[PDB]
Amino acid sequence: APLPQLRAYTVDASWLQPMAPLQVADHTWQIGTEDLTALLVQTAEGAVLLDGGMPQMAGHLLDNMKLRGVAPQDLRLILLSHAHADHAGPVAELKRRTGAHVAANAETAVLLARGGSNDLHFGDGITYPPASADRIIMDGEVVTVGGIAFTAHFMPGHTPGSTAWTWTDTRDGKPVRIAYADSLSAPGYQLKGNPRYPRLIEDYKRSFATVRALPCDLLLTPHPGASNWNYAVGSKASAEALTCNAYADAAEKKFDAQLARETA
Amino acid sequence: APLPQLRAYTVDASWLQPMAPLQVADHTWQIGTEDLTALLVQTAEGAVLLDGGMPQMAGHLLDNMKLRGVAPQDLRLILLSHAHADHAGPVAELKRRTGAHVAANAETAVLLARGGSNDLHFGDGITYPPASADRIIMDGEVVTVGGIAFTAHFMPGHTPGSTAWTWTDTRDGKPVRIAYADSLSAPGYQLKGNPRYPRLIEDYKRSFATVRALPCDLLLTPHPGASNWNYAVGSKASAEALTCNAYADAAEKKFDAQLARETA
Amino acid sequence: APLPQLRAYTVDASWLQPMAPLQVADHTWQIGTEDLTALLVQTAEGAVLLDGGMPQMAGHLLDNMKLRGVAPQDLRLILLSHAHADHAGPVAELKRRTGAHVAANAETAVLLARGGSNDLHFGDGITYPPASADRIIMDGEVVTVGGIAFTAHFMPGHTPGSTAWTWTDTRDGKPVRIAYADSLSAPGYQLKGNPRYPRLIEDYKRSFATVRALPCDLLLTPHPGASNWNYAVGSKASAEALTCNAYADAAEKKFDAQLARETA
Amino acid sequence: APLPQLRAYTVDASWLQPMAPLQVADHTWQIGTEDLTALLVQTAEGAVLLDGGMPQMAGHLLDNMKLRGVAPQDLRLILLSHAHADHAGPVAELKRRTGAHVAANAETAVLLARGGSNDLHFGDGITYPPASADRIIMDGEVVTVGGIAFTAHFMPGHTPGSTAWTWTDTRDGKPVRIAYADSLSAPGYQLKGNPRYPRLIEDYKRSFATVRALPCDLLLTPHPGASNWNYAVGSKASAEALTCNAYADAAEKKFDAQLARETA
Numbered sequence A, B, C, D: 001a002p003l004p005q006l007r008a009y010t011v012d013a014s015w016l017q018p019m020a021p022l023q024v025a026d027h028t029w030q031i032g033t034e035d036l037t038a039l040l041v042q043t044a045e046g047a048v049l050l051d052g053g054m055p056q057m058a059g060h061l062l063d064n065m066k067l068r069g070v071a072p073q074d075l076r077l078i079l080l081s082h083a084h085a086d087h088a089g090p091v092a093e094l095k096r097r098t099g100a101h102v103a104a105n106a107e108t109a110v111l112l113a114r115g116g117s118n119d120l121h122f123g124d125g126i127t128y129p130p131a132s133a134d135r136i137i138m139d140g141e142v143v144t145v146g147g148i149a150f151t152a153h154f155m156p157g158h159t160p161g162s163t164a165w166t167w168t169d170t171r172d173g174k175p176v177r178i179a180y181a182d183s184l185s186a187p188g189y190q191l192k193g194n195p196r197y198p199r200l201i202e203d204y205k206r207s208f209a210t211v212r213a214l215p216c217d218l219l220l221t222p223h224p225g226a227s228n229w230n231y232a233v234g235s236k237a238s239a240e241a242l243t244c245n246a247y248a249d250a251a252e253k254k255f256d257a258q259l260a261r262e263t264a
């Protein structure tokens, strides 16, 4: 009766389906997969990448960046929603091959430094290669690259370092406020009385209100289905996309129902 | 045509077969599995653990330590042969649950800090939870716990930070010199002209001579089969065990044959 | 006209005046200096140290711990108020010589990992040897050592990771609720519109209310003068000590006056 | 009788005397001070900086890089001789302000990660802000930036991670082999029987032979006086410069004399 073997982190095949760069605004591009968002913001002084997806997506990301005329040495900054394997997986490999830096808050940095191990809910089940953060950012801090300002909005819940990023881009001259809001889900979490996260419910509640008040004309999420995006229908991907209010209100309804079922 | 899924690190079932603590000397015990060595040295001022095996062995290690009258808070120091998943796997979990410290050289420390990721030969294929080293030790440095001196002997090759540990114990009063020598294998390595390890062959050659000159009456290895140990036959486990000269000489014969076949 | 020389971190001589262990409760002791608090909590399963003072106090701390019958290997856990040189200075040296672990939140951990460098207000002016945290704790998390529960209460302001610790001890059988509240000062900080700390005022306001609602019968602070302690008059040190309400209310009056003067 | 105050790291005024960029080859420049070497190698795909000097030199380095038409975002890689405060001081500040990466061996990385604290000989007396290495390099490894190959040559002694860098540049078309060899001194070290460095003498001896066999037409050192450079007389700075053989032979004569005097 030997000990169990190690189990790999397996995801749906749609999370790993490569796609060509889909344009979101004049400078913003989706270069991830069909069910995983990886945003590229091209500026005059370099490129900014938000999230990266699964650890085995680093090659596909460099391929799409090459398609957009972005050399590896042109990636300046990597920003993250939260440091889980399905969103910050290839961060370590992308740092070695691009010369980019990583900016994240303290909670995302310490989780990223241990490769997502010792998770508050998942333990060591979802482990990815570790990476270090080069710049620690605070709530409301502005990160500027090539004349584009990225404002961080802390929204703890899914992870203690969950962060929504807001920036203003154009769409044929007309400005558009983009809000890349992190996930507001809690799959299988113990919500009430968690010894590892004593103030989990209070953080989620404050994060719901944080998402509602985000300056947003167009909303994106790490998982495109969370905001009703569909990267498969390229030009009509943002057809039935939710607002910031509709996204936070829908997430809280599932949170209260899950919280009430946990008490039973 | 989606990207490939992540693949888990799977080993032979004999590597994960738990075993009761097998005694090696008056203070040294084997508390790992049948095919993975994990040594416990009980002193008057605490316990010392050398290696830990696979990442899913932390519970079994604490079980055997409990059998030897060693509380979790009694583990003082964790020493390592080399920082691969099949030998330093549970180091991170053991640090959280025992209050122990880790002593290793700089090369083992940096590899352990990134959880074995970005390996010089294996890449990210063999990843385990990361852990940090608390004390950096040099070649020939002595680590003393409870009146027992542990001397480090650098033997780079399998990893840049491969280390053999020598200490003197007793066997019913009579002293015995124990040498825990690291692995001298190179499974599937590119030996000649490796860009990641330009001086690999020269390090192996110097390590062969380092193992031959080790003060040793009884030899152990991370994999017991490498030194002809058989943990299954408890009392007769050290029956046909190799000397330090026979172990290094046998490893070099396989190295030259592998090196010559690589040139063809 | 050469560049300026490096300037050392110099403090008042009263901050470095060694003192004998002054008892606070049945298990709590002050073993720091006259103007720097360093608390030792002796339990049945080991000792807990809160803060350490200046970096050159590690020897004095080990001397006082020896006076209390606490061996170096008996220090199990180091807790911190905030990671500045005058309170977490000797943490690195104490870890090497005691085999203890450090528990702190993510913000204190990342600041401690870079030795207090790149401070949000002080820059590199107050640098101390770096140390790594072994356990990351959340707001409201309980840390138990030897049957004594230490509850963390986040109170950001002086530093992003400022933490107040509450635990219940006895005084000749009768229980006493002790609250070790961090500093609520802001010496020379830019309060409004700080690019490195955009939500500084809002964090201070929430920290004032956090301190008022602390379960507390006896209050201590990293600097004893902040809570009207006087370690010099040993038995009557806690004579005119402030409550939690009086301490937070007095700190906010100075914060509003400083905030109003900054606007002028 | 209070504890002693912290003492700052003070150096000679000539170590902090700023100087204009002095040219060494077609792509190599000295942009440090008169008595501290900081080399800038301008390539078509970015700039490479070797060492930085004292921690308070980051501003002067960026000033000279601006004079050479090198923007902060054009610094790609920082290489180091050894990680002491007088040579890797501003590395942390330069990483925050340039977007560059650091490549160093494991021994230099772990020393740089703790800001030079816990030195094998100096203790905590020479502390500088900590920085992390992004790429770990081995002995003989080649680092290529903009078509220029930088080969690492390990020469342990002054520090365990001391490294000499060799690269080929031109001087009006004609190629020149440049060897930036680390310091071979040992000021006040205990050479024989050092518990922190048991194989110190053997490392120095092997480093002497490593320096003699360096491919070198022009030799530079972290301290220019060690190789008889004089940055003050700009055009004639390399007048009486030593060869690699003359530098290693002169260093070993002082090592044997110091070693013999230590035995007395």
Ligand SMILES: CO[C@@]1(NC(=O)[C@@H](C)C(=O)O)C(=O)N2C(C(=O)O)=C(C)CO[C@@H]21
Residues within 6 Å of the ligand: A011, A084, A085, A086, A122, A126, A158, A183, A184, A185, A187, A223
């Ligand atoms: C770690 O990755 C996740 N979890 C899993 O894949 C497994 C472990 C699972 O929850 O069944 C995780 O969190 N995600 C999110 C999110 O919204 O962020 C959702 C909705 C679920 O998928 C990913």
Ligand SMILES: CO[C@@]1(NC(=O)[C@@H](C)C(=O)O)C(=O)N2C(C(=O)O)=C(C)CO[C@@H]21
Residues within 6 Å of the ligand: B011, B084, B085, B086, B122, B126, B158, B183, B184, B185, B187, B223
């Ligand atoms: C990473 O673990 C090892 N490698 C593997 O498990 C796979 C990847 C394999 O080599 O086929 C590794 O190294 N070991 C040793 C050793 O002697 O250390 C030997 C002999 C082979 O097994 C383990």
Ligand SMILES: CO[C@@]1(NC(=O)[C@@H](C)C(=O)O)C(=O)N2C(C(=O)O)=C(C)CO[C@@H]21
Residues within 6 Å of the ligand: C011, C084, C085, C086, C122, C126, C158, C183, C184, C185, C187, C223
């Ligand atoms: C970094 O140490 C401090 N600052 C200084 O020593 C200098 C830099 C200064 O502020 O003039 C700091 O913060 N302290 C506190 C506190 O309340 O924590 C107070 C009240 C002032 O003293 C220490």
Ligand SMILES: CO[C@@]1(NC(=O)[C@@H](C)C(=O)O)C(=O)N2C(C(=O)O)=C(C)CO[C@@H]21
Residues within 6 Å of the ligand: D011, D084, D085, D086, D122, D126, D158, D183, D184, D185, D187, D223
């Ligand atoms: C830490 O910096 C050094 N040491 C000092 O400044 C003091 C502590 C001193 O040794 O008196 C150090 O090493 N250097 C070297 C070198 O060759 O690297 C030499 C020759 C001496 O100066 C610097």
Ligand SMILES: [Zn+2]
Residues within 6 Å of the ligand: A082, A084, A158, A183
């Ligand atoms: Zn997630």
Ligand SMILES: [Zn+2]
Residues within 6 Å of the ligand: A084, A086, A087, A183, A222, A223
């Ligand atoms: Zn997810």
Ligand SMILES: [Zn+2]
Residues within 6 Å of the ligand: B082, B084, B158, B183
């Ligand atoms: Zn191995």
Ligand SMILES: [Zn+2]
Residues within 6 Å of the ligand: B084, B086, B087, B183, B222, B223
């Ligand atoms: Zn192995």
Ligand SMILES: [Zn+2]
Residues within 6 Å of the ligand: C082, C084, C158, C183
């Ligand atoms: Zn402070």
Ligand SMILES: [Zn+2]
Residues within 6 Å of the ligand: C084, C086, C087, C183, C222, C223
């Ligand atoms: Zn203070």
Ligand SMILES: [Zn+2]
Residues within 6 Å of the ligand: D082, D084, D158, D183
């Ligand atoms: Zn030096």
Ligand SMILES: [Zn+2]
Residues within 6 Å of the ligand: D084, D086, D087, D183, D222, D223
């Ligand atoms: Zn020097």
